[PDB]
Structure 1
Amino acid sequence: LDNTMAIRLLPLPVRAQLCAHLDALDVWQQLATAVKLYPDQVEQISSQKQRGRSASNEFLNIWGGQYNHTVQTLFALFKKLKLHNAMRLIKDYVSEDLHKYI
């Protein structure tokens, strides 16, 4: 069922589009809360953002990096938080059978 690549393997181009989009929407805190990241993880993201870096990229670094989550799981998270345009940006790295939810 889940044959998608690990989030950490997402090509830089698509990753940059996704993060730029999520940062504009400013949903990093919503993402972190939804997966229940710990205080130190939340602060690490907030911290990176204050330093001018992408908050969502840091979220992917933590959630995708340490927990080895897949693009499909990321797709499901977006689906739960109704981030449809985020889902569309990664539709090409997920099974076509899931495009109905976009």
Structure 2
Amino acid sequence: RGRSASNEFLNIWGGQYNHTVQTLFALFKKLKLHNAMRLIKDYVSEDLHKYI
């Protein structure tokens, strides 16, 4: 009979775990995007410098 309160807890926990893991992945993407943009701006800058 206690399976109810256990499955309830496990269901809520799963959603919170997923919410946290999704946030982690979103942060990893945000970091990769930042590094890619930094790289692209450095390269653009390098290209333009030969016309200065």
Which category of TM-score, normalised to the shorter sequence, fits these structures? under 0.3
Q: Please, which runs of 5 or more residues in structure 1 have no aligned partner?
A: 1-50
Residues 70 and 82 of structure 1: is their aligned pair in 2 closer, same or farther, counting only changes over 3 Å? same
Distance 1:67 1:56, change over 3 A: same
Q: Does residue 20 of structure 2 align to residue 66 of structure 1?
A: no
Structure showing greater relative contact order (alpha-carbon pairs closer than 8 Å, 6 or more residues apart): 1
**Aligned alpha-carbon RMSD (Å):** 15.4
Give the Cα–Cα distance (whole angstroms) in 2 for the partners of residues 61 and 100 of structure 1: 60
List structure 1 segments (4+ residues) > 4 angstroms apart after TM superposition.
Answer: 69-102
Query: TM-score, normalization: structure 2?
Result: 0.26
Superposition deviation, residue 80 in structure 1: 33
Determine which structure has more spread, i.e. the larger CA radius of gyration: 2
Q: How many residues align?
A: 52
Sequence identity of aligned pairs in percent? 100
> Aligned to 2:3, what secondary structure does the other structure show?
coil
The DSSP-based 3-state class of the residue aligned with 1:68 is helix
Q: Post-superposition shift, 1:66?
A: 2.4
Quote the offset at 1:82 in angstroms.
Answer: 39
- Aligned CA distance change for structure 1 residues 60 and 94 (closer, same or farther; 3 Å): farther
Deviations 1:21-41 (A, max 9, x none): xxxxxxxxxxxxxxxxxxxxx
Q: Normalising by structure 1, what TM-score?
A: 0.15
Q: What is the deviation of 1:57?
A: 0.4
* 1:68 to 1:81, Cα distance in 2 relative to 1, 3 A: same
Q: Which runs of 5+ in 2 are unaligned?
A: none
Deviates more, 1:52-61 or 1:79-88: 79-88
